Curated annotation (Swiss-Prot), chain B:
Subunit structure: Homotetramer. Interacts with TRPM1; the interaction results in the formation of a heteromultimeric cation channel complex that are functionally different from the homomeric channels.
Intramembrane segment spans (from-to): 83-99
Topological domains annotated Extracellular: 66-82, 100-108
Protein name: Transient receptor potential cation channel subfamily M member 3
Chain ranges passing through the membrane: 1-22, 38-65, 109-134
Portion of the full-length sequence here: 992 to 1153 of 1732
Phenotype seen when the gene is deleted: Trpm3-deficient mice exhibit clear deficits in their avoidance to noxious heat. Trpm3-deficient mice display reduced hypersensitivity to thermal, but not to mechanical, stimuli in carrageen-induced inflammatory pain. In the chronic constriction injury (CCI) model of neuropathic pain, intraperitoneal injection of isosakuranetin or primidone do not reduced heat sensitivity in Trpm3-deficient mice.
Length: 512, 150
């Protein structure tokens, strides 16, 4: 219950249940001893038990996750609020121990360090160290150099092209004969090329670019009574994308259909995609009707194309420099919202004053609510036309107190364009280093999720993914790498010896 | 006439090449190299602004004119007016015209709202973030430029 949905402790297995039914020993006693010390808030005992035995990094990550879960449970049940602080401190200590051990292992030997993070852990419900670190939301562990290089190796697949990627992958996708010219890591070459995560990502990117081109074409030119070929291709793309989203919902982690909906709705992109697909379905339904409903469907298409243009930032978030910038944009959006509230108050004040002064004989109409916001808002973006505001009133009679409007305009412009915008620039300037560092760490953490979700995806892009969906139905009646790495007993022994050497060297260096 | 036009483009280049001569002054060389690096940063932010601009332009062109034959003038109206709009030319009669009066197009009230959102994003968020980026990465660039010039 504390670890997660997919975790399976050895105590609840059928073999241990049968052994405990008629009541031996434990192969690794320090695992159970450290779990006991962690569950009972004995930090010194847990730290003593951590450095004895094998799988030190796995024990550190498991202890960090357990302490975090216990802190959350204690804070939920209104404890003394000092237990929660102690548990959070314990979790931070164990996370720091894991990070320092990883740093020592990577500094000593690199290949064995990578082998440490991917080999399957039989004692911990068959989960690698990367999965334990991700399940603990440990951002400083995934953002380490060794974890990043391992993720790059997983992302590149079975290819060794490391000089200039992307262009060669694009050439291979566009020229299938050009595939048999790339070096591979130690017929089947095509299967290894089309199953790498990077090739799947570029296939999806090219399909999305073509879909955007077709959407622009169908909205720009005149729409006839019945959909043209490009409109049918766009509708097919939307339908297959919706089917793929439903398939991803179905194969989530929880065992209930209603519970998987919440977990899938955790991310904002999924919610926005669902809303956009529903809106496109409504617009397509309204499009196949008479003329006014056809126009309404066309307008819905235009709004939807705004969203699908905006969604290119998700694709851009794979570049090393275009992901942190997008997350910085997100946080600066919150700050800009606060300052927009104040500017809106000032703008409403000026607009109401000018509208009331200049036009004193207006009947109640909804056009009054438009003149308040429209002109003062366009005024602060350079459209400061001084004949439309305070007109020179042969000449028409001057309204009573119409000389106040230019003075109020001067004060409003001085406040809006010299004070608030400069203060906003200062706010963005003095809170940039922290936001930049946080964005870098979060992007390096989410690289793992990107790689995993493109490793689990099918090969064909959504325009022609309907073939891959039918094969799953046909195979319904019937991880060597990418997730784990299975090794023999000699390799396991060598890994254990290397880890013990690393931890004893780390403690010796710390003491010295 | 074609040769004359090529001459005009070439004169642009030969005017730009005065920075090579300016790079002998003690204070006008480091500034040019700083300009070079800030050009790379400005390229990154130009990509994002271009995405936003294309979205708004396509939306406005599709909403306002629904009976246009396929022509290369469509590809011009997307980039032209939204690009000149963010440099102070925010003429509100050319965009969302007041439609004696001609009939109002279906859903033509969305264009000013989209314009407001687009202006707020382009002129308050991205440019201020670019100013912050230039501001917080100036000391290192300045020192590197001084060393490289020397
Ligand atoms: C003198 C007032 C006459 C009111 C009747 C005519 C009103 C027409 C002019 C409006 C002037 C209202 C401004 C009064 C606000 C000052 C309040 C104060 O001093 O508290 C200090 C207050 C604290 O005093 P404390 O209690 O000692 O802490 O500090 C503040 O909060 C100042 C920040 C708010 C003022 C900035 C916004 C001013 C923008 C006005 C520009 C006009 C836009 C027109 C379009
Ligand atoms: C609600 C969506 C309805 C879509 C149908 C109508 C679309 C018309 C309005 C377009 C609104 C689309 C914006 C949706 C983007 C939000 C995605 C998100 O929340 O992910 C957070 C995402 C992360 O969530 P995480 O997975 O938890 O990490 O963080 C970001 O990347 C935010 C930065 C991108 C948003 C800034 C750009 C917004 C500009 C829009 C201005 C409109 C210009 C029009 C001209
Ligand atoms: C339509 C596309 C829109 C979505 C764009 C999709 C998002 C996107 O832009 O891709 C990112 C990727 C760039 O990364 P890519 O692997 O190709 O190359 C990186 C680049 O060469 C850096 O200079 C390297 O060192 P550093 O960082 O300076 O230290 C870095 O090495 P490392 O540190 O990793 O070991 C390299 O990774 O691909 C391209 O843009 C190449 C042209 C292909 C795209 C151009 C053709 C379209
Ligand atoms: C074309 O003819 C229209 C007619 C119906 C006319 O009804 C009128 C009823 C009052 C109403 C809704 C109208 C115009 C100004 C409207 C104000 C604008 C204000 O703005 C807000 C702005 C921001 C707020 C903070 C302050 O108030 C409103 C509370 C305020 C506001 C909405 C009060 C309501 C006013 C229209 C049709 O019927 C046959
Ligand atoms: C004067 O008459 C011209 C006529 C030839 C007309 O051909 C038309 C063919 C479609 C084409 C090339 C035309 C106008 C809009 C064009 C779109 C603009 C889009 O912009 C881009 C913008 C940015 C992209 C991201 C999205 O798409 C295009 C993929 C898109 C684009 C280039 C698709 C192609 C469209 C012209 C002459 O023949 C006798
Ligand atoms: Na201006
Ligand atoms: Na102007």
């Amino acid at each position: 219950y504390l670890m997660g949905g997919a975790y399976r402790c050895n105590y609840t297995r059928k073999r241990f249940r049968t052994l405990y039914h008629n009541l031996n020993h434990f192969p690794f006693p320090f695992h159970e001893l450290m779990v006991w010390a962690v569950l009972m808030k004995r930090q010194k005992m847990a730290l003593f038990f951590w450095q004895h035995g094998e799988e030190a990094m796995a024990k550190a990550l498991v202890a960090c996750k357990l302490c975090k879960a216990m802190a959350h449970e204690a804070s939920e049940n209104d404890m003394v609020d000092d237990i929660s602080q102690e548990l959070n401190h314990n979790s931070r200590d164990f996370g720091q121990l894991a990070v320092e051990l990883l740093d020592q292992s990577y500094k000593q030997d690199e290949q064995l360090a990578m082998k440490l993070l991917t080999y399957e852990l039989k004692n911990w419900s068959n989960a690698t160290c990367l999965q334990l670190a991700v399940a603990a939301k440990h951002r400083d562990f995934i953002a380490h150099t060794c974890s990043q290089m391992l993720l790059t190796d997983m992302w590149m697949g079975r290819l060794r092209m490391r000089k200039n990627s992307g262009l060669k992958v694009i050439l291979g996708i566009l020229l299938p004969p050009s595939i048999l010219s790339l070096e591979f890591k130690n017929g089947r070459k095509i299967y290894e090329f089309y199953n790498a995560p990077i090739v799947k990502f570029w296939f999806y990117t090219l399909a999305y670019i073509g879909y955007l081109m077709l959407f622009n074409y169908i909205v720009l030119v005149k729409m006839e009574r019945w959909p043209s070929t490009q409109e049918w291709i766009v509708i097919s793309y939307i339908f297959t994308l919706g089917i793929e989203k439903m398939r991803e919902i179905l194969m989530s982690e929880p065992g209930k259909l209603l519970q998987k909906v919440k977990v899938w709705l955790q991310e904002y992109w999924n919610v926005t995609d669902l809303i956009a697909i529903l809106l496109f379905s409504v617009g397509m339904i309204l499009r196949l009707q008479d003329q006014p409903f056809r126009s309404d469907g066309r307008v819905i298409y235009c709004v939807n194309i705004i969203y699908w243009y905006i969604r290119l930032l998700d694709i851009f978030g794979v570049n090393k420099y275009l992901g942190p910038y997008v997350m910085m944009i997100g946080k600066m959006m919150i700050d800009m919202m606060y300052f927009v509230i104040i500017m809106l108050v000032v703008l409403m004040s000026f607009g109401v004053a000018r509208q009331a002064i200049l036009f004193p004989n207006e009947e109640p109409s909804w056009k009054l609510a438009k003149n308040i916001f429209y002109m003062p808002y366009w005024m602060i973006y350079g459209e400061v036309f001084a004949d439309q505001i305070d007109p020179p009133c042969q000449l028409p009679p001057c309204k009573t107190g119409a000389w106040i409007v230019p003075a109020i305009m001067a004060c409003y412009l001085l406040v809006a364009n010299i004070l608030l915008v400069n203060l906003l620039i200062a706010v963005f300037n003095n809170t940039f280093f922290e936001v930049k560092s946080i964005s870098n760490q979060v992007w390096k953490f989410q690289r793992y999720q990107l790689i995993m979700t493109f490793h689990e995806r099918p090969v064909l892009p959504p325009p022609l993914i309907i073939f891959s969906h039918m094969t799953m139905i046909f195979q319904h009646v019937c991880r060597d790498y990418g997730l784990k790495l299975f090794i023999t007993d000699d390799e396991l022994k060598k890994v254990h010896d290397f880890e013990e050497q690393c931890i004893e060297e780390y403690f010796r260096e710390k003491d010295d």
